[PDB]
Design an enzyme around this catalytic site. Structure first.
Site, PDB file in Angstrom:
ATOM      1  N   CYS A   1     -40.918  32.176  -4.936  1.00 47.95           N
ATOM      2  CA  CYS A   1     -39.861  32.570  -4.016  1.00 47.95           C
ATOM      3  C   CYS A   1     -39.908  34.080  -3.822  1.00 47.95           C
ATOM      4  O   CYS A   1     -40.879  34.608  -3.267  1.00 47.95           O
ATOM      5  CB  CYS A   1     -38.488  32.126  -4.528  1.00 47.95           C
ATOM      6  SG  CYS A   1     -38.137  32.533  -6.249  1.00 47.95           S
ATOM      7  N   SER A   2     -38.876  34.787  -4.281  1.00 49.34           N
ATOM      8  CA  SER A   2     -38.897  36.243  -4.254  1.00 49.34           C
ATOM      9  C   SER A   2     -39.293  36.781  -5.623  1.00 49.34           C
ATOM     10  O   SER A   2     -40.399  37.305  -5.796  1.00 49.34           O
ATOM     11  CB  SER A   2     -37.536  36.800  -3.827  1.00 49.34           C
ATOM     12  OG  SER A   2     -36.497  36.287  -4.640  1.00 49.34           O
ATOM     13  N   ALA A   3     -38.395  36.654  -6.601  1.00 45.77           N
ATOM     14  CA  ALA A   3     -38.710  37.044  -7.969  1.00 45.77           C
ATOM     15  C   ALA A   3     -39.469  35.963  -8.724  1.00 45.77           C
ATOM     16  O   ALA A   3     -40.082  36.259  -9.756  1.00 45.77           O
ATOM     17  CB  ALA A   3     -37.426  37.397  -8.725  1.00 45.77           C
ATOM     18  N   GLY A   4     -39.439  34.724  -8.238  1.00 42.86           N
ATOM     19  CA  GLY A   4     -40.200  33.655  -8.855  1.00 42.86           C
ATOM     20  C   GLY A   4     -39.581  33.053 -10.095  1.00 42.86           C
ATOM     21  O   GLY A   4     -40.309  32.541 -10.952  1.00 42.86           O
ATOM     22  N   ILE A   5     -38.255  33.098 -10.223  1.00 40.09           N
ATOM     23  CA  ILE A   5     -37.595  32.568 -11.412  1.00 40.09           C
ATOM     24  C   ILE A   5     -36.420  31.680 -11.020  1.00 40.09           C
ATOM     25  O   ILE A   5     -36.150  30.669 -11.677  1.00 40.09           O
ATOM     26  CB  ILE A   5     -37.145  33.705 -12.354  1.00 40.09           C
ATOM     27  CG1 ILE A   5     -36.095  34.596 -11.688  1.00 40.09           C
ATOM     28  CG2 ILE A   5     -38.336  34.543 -12.798  1.00 40.09           C
ATOM     29  CD1 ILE A   5     -35.663  35.765 -12.538  1.00 40.09           C
ATOM     30  N   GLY A   6     -35.721  32.037  -9.944  1.00 41.04           N
ATOM     31  CA  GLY A   6     -34.521  31.323  -9.549  1.00 41.04           C
ATOM     32  C   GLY A   6     -34.795  30.049  -8.777  1.00 41.04           C
ATOM     33  O   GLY A   6     -34.791  28.954  -9.348  1.00 41.04           O
ATOM     34  N   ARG A   7     -35.018  30.183  -7.466  1.00 39.68           N
ATOM     35  CA  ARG A   7     -35.400  29.029  -6.657  1.00 39.68           C
ATOM     36  C   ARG A   7     -36.669  28.383  -7.193  1.00 39.68           C
ATOM     37  O   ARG A   7     -36.787  27.152  -7.217  1.00 39.68           O
ATOM     38  CB  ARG A   7     -35.601  29.450  -5.202  1.00 39.68           C
ATOM     39  CG  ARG A   7     -34.333  29.840  -4.466  1.00 39.68           C
ATOM     40  CD  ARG A   7     -34.645  30.200  -3.021  1.00 39.68           C
ATOM     41  NE  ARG A   7     -33.698  31.166  -2.477  1.00 39.68           N
ATOM     42  CZ  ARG A   7     -33.751  31.652  -1.245  1.00 39.68           C
ATOM     43  NH1 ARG A   7     -34.702  31.292  -0.399  1.00 39.68           N
ATOM     44  NH2 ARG A   7     -32.823  32.520  -0.850  1.00 39.68           N
TER      45      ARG A   7
ATOM     46  N   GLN B   1     -31.590  30.242 -12.497  1.00 41.67           N
ATOM     47  CA  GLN B   1     -30.806  31.462 -12.651  1.00 41.67           C
ATOM     48  C   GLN B   1     -29.306  31.226 -12.761  1.00 41.67           C
ATOM     49  O   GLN B   1     -28.639  31.910 -13.542  1.00 41.67           O
ATOM     50  CB  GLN B   1     -31.075  32.407 -11.475  1.00 41.67           C
ATOM     51  CG  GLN B   1     -32.313  33.272 -11.642  1.00 41.67           C
ATOM     52  CD  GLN B   1     -32.130  34.344 -12.696  1.00 41.67           C
ATOM     53  OE1 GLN B   1     -31.405  35.316 -12.488  1.00 41.67           O
ATOM     54  NE2 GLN B   1     -32.785  34.169 -13.838  1.00 41.67           N
TER      55      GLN B   1
ATOM     56  N   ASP C   1     -29.030  31.031   2.744  1.00 42.54           N
ATOM     57  CA  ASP C   1     -28.934  32.417   2.302  1.00 42.54           C
ATOM     58  C   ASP C   1     -28.024  32.551   1.089  1.00 42.54           C
ATOM     59  O   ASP C   1     -28.273  33.391   0.217  1.00 42.54           O
ATOM     60  CB  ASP C   1     -28.424  33.298   3.443  1.00 42.54           C
ATOM     61  CG  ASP C   1     -29.411  33.401   4.589  1.00 42.54           C
ATOM     62  OD1 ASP C   1     -30.619  33.573   4.322  1.00 42.54           O
ATOM     63  OD2 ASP C   1     -28.978  33.309   5.757  1.00 42.54           O
TER      64      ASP C   1
END
Ligand SMILES: Nc1nccc(Sc2cnc(N3CCC4(CC3)Cc3ccccc3[C@H]4N)nn2)c1Cl
EC number: 3.1.3.48
Length: 499
Positions: free
Chosen positions: A433-439, A480, A399
């Site tokens: 992932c969520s926004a698709g840029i970080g993970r 990120q 998390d």
């Protein structure tokens, strides 16, 4: 074009005094947050006073407090500098960037570097026009510009050193204009190159690359970066280059497409977005999905967001159209009480129709780190379009921050790579992932670097910031945080050590 409003080495008190004494109402700067390491602060001047606005990044996006979520700080600043009454319950204006003079995050600045080491580096990895700026080892406060010129060791090339004097807070090369910063000096002589006697032009063509290294030297480099080029200096230098990647995202801003974005300001670049065809002729805009093709330099990738309830059908249209056979999902459906991705797959042994697309969940296989779902995707009404899509759902990403050990991610990517390689003419690998840029960007960048090592062993050049910048040119803000930056280095180091 510029990112001078970001000050890497300033404090909150220094930010206030800088804006109060050298700025006006509407002036602003960005800086790292020392009260929340890993976060950032936007300091803005108003009515003769300074306000500080928190910008937090846990790994998915830049979350401006009381504002919106963005993929980069440059895209954040660009958004509010052209949208007047967005930032706030009083409204705040971003009018004048207060430019930083610190050369810390410049690609050509290398701090405490001896003259002999500068000659060595320019000799071994420099080209015609490769230059660097270093501190003067004899006169503290002064600097030296070292440039390589010649034809691309027979004397046909050379290294010229140019002294930079600091006189009453201004810099100069012994004559001509006096500059308020090394950045202004370097920029001026890039445009107007120095010409010594006998006619040699000291062209400042590109900075000296010191991040590309041999794969076997990764463990040594990670040790150097962990304790004056450190992890923070290297990452923030890469972050400064994000201002060159402000490509248009107009298709994602259209009214018909706003609700198809999980975050209204995290959008795909127009020139790399996945364009969906053969859509419903009654739907006016049916070609959009928040997703980008990512090409290395070999497999390719589609970096996309976690599905919304109203984009599940478009997601499967994308998977079908691009002939994707492997999906990598690096997030739970819910994390810390927040919805990150709607369930876009059927239950095990179940069959669902998502618009014109039909998906059967054939079998689920649970490992510790991930679950594998074998899905058959086909178009309704056409029994000859079926193909197997393997969804790898990574479950153990923490998390907070990044995994403490990269072994789970590496074994995961190794399995994904072999599944993809075993399928002939398979399309790009879908990662989200969520926004698709970080993970998502972290997984993709690791996979790109590992693929180079997998085929070339220890005898290959890898350049982590160059690879990230190339990936960032195809989707906003891929990778990120500095924690993800360090995690990429550690995963590559761990992969090499087990060769
Ligand atoms: N395309 C592309 N290719 C390769 C790299 C990049 S970013 C990048 C990242 N890191 C670097 N260095 C060189 C500059 C330093 C960090 C290490 C070295 C040093 C020493 C003391 C104090 C500060 C600094 C930093 N100024 N260069 N470019 C990009 Cl954008």
């Amino acid at each position: 074009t510029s990112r001078r409003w970001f000050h890497p080495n300033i404090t909150g008190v220094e930010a206030e005094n800088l804006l109060l004494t050298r700025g006006v109402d509407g002036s602003f700067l960005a800086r790292p947050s020392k009260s929340n390491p890993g976060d950032f602060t936007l300091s803005v001047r108003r009515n003769g006073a300074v306000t500080h606005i928190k910008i937090q990044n846990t790994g998915d996006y830049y979350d401006l407090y009381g504002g919106e979520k963005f993929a980069t700080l440059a895209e954040l600043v660009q958004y509010y500098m052209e949208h007047h009454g967005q930032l706030k319950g009083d409204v705040i204006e971003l009018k004048y960037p207060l430019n930083c003079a610190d050369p810390t995050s410049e690609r050509w600045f290398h701090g405490h570097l001896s003259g002999k080491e500068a000659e060595k580096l320019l000799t071994e990895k420099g080209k015609h026009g490769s230059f660097l700026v270093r501190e003067s080892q004899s006169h503290p406060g002064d600097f030296v510009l070292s440039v390589r010129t010649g034809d691309d060791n027979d004397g046909k090339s050379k290294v010229t050193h140019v002294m930079i004097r600091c006189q009453e807070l201004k810099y100069d090369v012994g004559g001509g204009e006096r500059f308020d910063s090394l950045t202004d000096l370097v920029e001026h002589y890039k445009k107007n190159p120095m010409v010594e006697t006998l006619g040699t032009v000291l062209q400042l063509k590109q900075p000296l690359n010191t991040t590309r290294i041999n794969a076997a030297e990764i463990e040594s480099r990670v040790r150097e970066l962990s304790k004056k080029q450190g992890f923070w200096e290297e990452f923030e230098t890469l972050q400064q280059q994000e201002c060159k990647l402000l490509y248009s995202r107009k298709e994602g801003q259209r009214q018909e497409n706003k609700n198809k974005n999980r975050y209204k300001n995290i959008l795909p670049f127009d020139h790399t977005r996945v364009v969906l065809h053969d859509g419903d002729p009654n739907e006016p805009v049916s070609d959009y999905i928040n997703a980008n093709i990512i090409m290395p330099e070999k497999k390719s990738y589609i970096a996309t967001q976690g599905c919304l309830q109203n984009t599940v059908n478009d997601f499967w249209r994308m998977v079908f159209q691009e002939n994707s056979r492997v999906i990598v999902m690096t997030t739970k459906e819910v994390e810390r009480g927040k919805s990150k991705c709607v369930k876009y797959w059927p239950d095990e042994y179940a069959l669902k129709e998502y618009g014109v697309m039909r998906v059967r969940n054939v079998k689920e296989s649970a490992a510790h780190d991930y679950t594998l779902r074998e899905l058959k995707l086909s178009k309704v009404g056409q029994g000859n379009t079926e193909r197997t899509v393997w969804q790898y759902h990574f479950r153990t990403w923490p998390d907070h921050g990044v995994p403490s050990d990269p072994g789970g991610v590496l074994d995961f990517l190794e399995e994904v790579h072999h599944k993809q390689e075993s399928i002939m003419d398979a399309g790009p690998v879908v990662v989200h992932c969520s926004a698709g840029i970080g993970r998502t960007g972290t997984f993709i960048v690791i996979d790109i670097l590992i693929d180079i090592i997998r085929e070339k062993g220890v005898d290959c050049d890898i350049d982590v910031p160059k690879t990230i910048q190339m990936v960032r040119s195809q989707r906003s803000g891929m990778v990120q945080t500095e924690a993800q930056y360090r995690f990429i280095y550690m995963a590559v180091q761990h992969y090499i050590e087990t060769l």
